[PDB]
Structure formats: structure tokens, C-alpha cells
Design an enzyme around this catalytic site. Structure first.
Site: not given
Ligand SMILES: Nc1ncnc2c1ncn2[C@@H]1O[C@H](COP(=O)(O)O)[C@@H](O)[C@H]1O
Length: 278
Positions: A115, A171-173
Site C-alpha cells: 500500500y 485479498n483483504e476480503a
């Protein structure tokens, strides 16, 4: 050293970007299920197998994101040990990579996959609009990339935002029930107005502390020496997670972490293999 098996995925998960919220939830849950170490759960949440030692990343899965049930999908190459996005495949067949020299035959996209690389700062996750149209536009932007395009400042900025969008919505999900539930909440039938939303500070903290949260829950599983108390969960106030039950409700799938008294890398991989894990 270069990764292996990038185009030999252990499984492929597919999602149609116009599909229902229920189908999205099913899609995310199926990724978690196929990634799990069947021999190692924590509070009935799946835990990834450890990262293989002595080898470059050699365990991968694909996610295919389709504009429609008939359309050719954008293929994402994601590590099956830590869920890192590293590659995506455009419509002309070009594999693009987020790390120079990692994927055999791939073309470096011009920026990295953290990020900080994508936004400038991990604190900026609260600025990223998520939703059905953002998902579709991100799929469009990356899928339409061709090897011969002349990169430009604006195009790279578009590509950064597209990758960021997918990292969050895929991915974060997968990593977090909070994030997957949030995204599922933005997906509605066509009879409902178009919707978009941004994550709050708790989810930002969670996203930026997956290893910390995973380790915090794993510590509670360590059986005490005889005559002592079970380890208590150490709150992570910034994530809004004060208890083990909250941690379990928050974690979609845990990163494997070696905690004192818990499974080692070698033993967890031994159990993974003994249970049929590949
Ligand atoms: N390529 C990537 N794809 C998805 N998540 C990433 C990626 N790189 C870093 N992360 C996230 O950032 C955390 C810290 O990574 P690191 O830079 O390896 O210390 C990881 O545990 C992931 O949650």
C-alpha cells in the site's frame, strides 16, 4: 530467485462482477476453504499452512474476475501461503508482475504491491472507494492493458488504483470477515442505486496488522503448563478487537505465525501434508 508454479494454480476461484452479494460471499468463503490447513484451525477459523522454507514461492492460486458470465476473465496470480497478489494477466495474454524478476516471462507493471507503493502511505486505505462499479472498472483497466502501450503518468495512476481496489475486494476480503462483509454490503441487485463506500479506521488497522491479529489469536490456543491459566487475548484497540471471540469473528483466515509454545513451521507443515494438503 524466481517463483515456481505461477501458472500451475492449486485452484481457481471465479467471480462474475455483476453477481449477487450472496455469490460474492460464497466466492470469498471458498477461497478461504481451499487455502486452509485442514490440520490447523484457531477458534474454528482456518489457518494457512506455513510458508515453505528453502524454496522461492512455489504455491499459487488464481482468481478470475469476469465482467459477465460469458466474458473472458482477468486472471490474478496470488500466493497460496500468504495471499500476496503478484501477477495479473491482460487480454492479450501478457502476465504483469508487481515485483521485478519474480514471475518467469512476466512484464513489470512499473510499481509494487504494497500500500505504500500503491497509495504512498498505508494510512490512505480509508480513501479508497470500493463497490461494484469500482470492481468492474478495475477489472476493465487491468484486463485491457497491452504489452505495447506507452506507459503514461495517468495510466500508471489508473493502474495503481485498480490494483488497490482488487487487493481490498479480493485479498483483504479473504483475510478478514470484516472486509468481506463490508464489500458484500455494497453489492446490490440492479433495482438498487449504485453504491460505493470506504473502510473505516478499524478495518484499516486490521488490514495493516494481519500478522499481529493472527498471532494474537494463535497465542490463546497454546495450552498452559499444568497448574496455570489459559493465555488471555491481548486487546488490539486500534482494530476494535478486544477479545478472542471478536478476533475469531474478525479473521477470515489466519496467517501462520510461530508463537512461543505453538506449532513450528516444520510441525505445522508436517500436519498439513498428513491431512492431504498440497
Ligand atoms: N503483494 C501483496 N499482496 C497482498 N498483500 C500484501 C502484499 N504485500 C504486502 N501485503 C500486506 O502487507 C503486510 C506486510 O508485508 P511486508 O511488506 O512483507 O512486511 C502483509 O502481511 C500483507 O497483509
Amino acid at each position: 530467485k524466481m517463483a515456481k508454479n505461477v501458472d500451475k494454480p492449486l485452484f481457481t476461484a471465479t467471480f462474475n462482477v455483476q453477481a449477487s452479494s450472496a455469490d460474492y460471499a460464497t466466492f470469498i468463503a471458498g477461497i478461504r476453504n481451499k487455502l486452509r490447513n485442514p490440520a490447523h484451525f484457531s477458534h474454528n477459523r482456518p489457518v494457512l499452512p506455513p510458508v515453505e522454507p528453502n524454496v522461492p514461492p512455489s504455491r499459487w492460486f488464481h482468481v478470475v474476475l469476469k465482467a459477465s458470465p460469458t466474458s473472458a476473465g482477468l486472471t490474478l496470480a496470488i500466493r497460496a501461503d500468504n495471499i500476496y497478489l503478484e501477477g495479473f494477466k491482460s487480454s492479450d495474454g501478457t502476465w504483469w508482475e508487481l515485483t521485478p524478476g519474480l514471475i518467469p516471462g512476466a512484464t513489470y507493471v512499473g510499481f509494487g504491491g504494497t500500500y505504500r507503493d500503491l497509495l504512498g502511505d498505508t494510512d490512505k486505505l480509508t480513501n479508497v472507494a470500493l463497490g461494484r462499479q469500482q470492481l468492474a472498472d478495475a477489472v476493465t483497466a487491468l484486463h485491457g492493458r497491452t504489452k505495447a502501450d506507452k506507459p503514461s503518468g495517468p495510466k500508471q495512476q489508473q493502474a495503481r488504483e485498480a490494483v488497490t481496489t482488487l487487493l481490498l475486494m479480493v485479498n483483504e476480503a479473504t483475510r478478514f470477515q470484516t472486509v468481506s462483509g463490508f464489500v458484500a454490503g455494497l453489492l446490490h441487485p440492479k433495482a438498487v442505486a449504485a453504491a460505493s463506500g470506504k473502510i473505516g479506521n478499524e478495518m484499516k488497522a486490521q488490514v495493516n496488522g494481519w500478522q499481529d491479529l493472527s498471532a494474537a489469536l494463535l497465542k490463546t490456543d497454546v495450552k498452559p503448563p499444568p497448574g496455570k491459566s489459559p493465555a488471555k487475548f491481548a486487546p488490539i484497540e486500534k482494530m476494535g478487537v478486544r477479545t478472542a471471540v471478536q478476533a475469531a469473528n474478525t479473521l477470515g483466515i489466519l496467517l501462520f505465525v510461530e508463537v512461543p509454545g505453538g506449532l513450528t513451521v516444520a510441525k505445522a507443515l508436517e500436519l498439513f501434508h498428513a491431512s492431504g494438503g498440497k
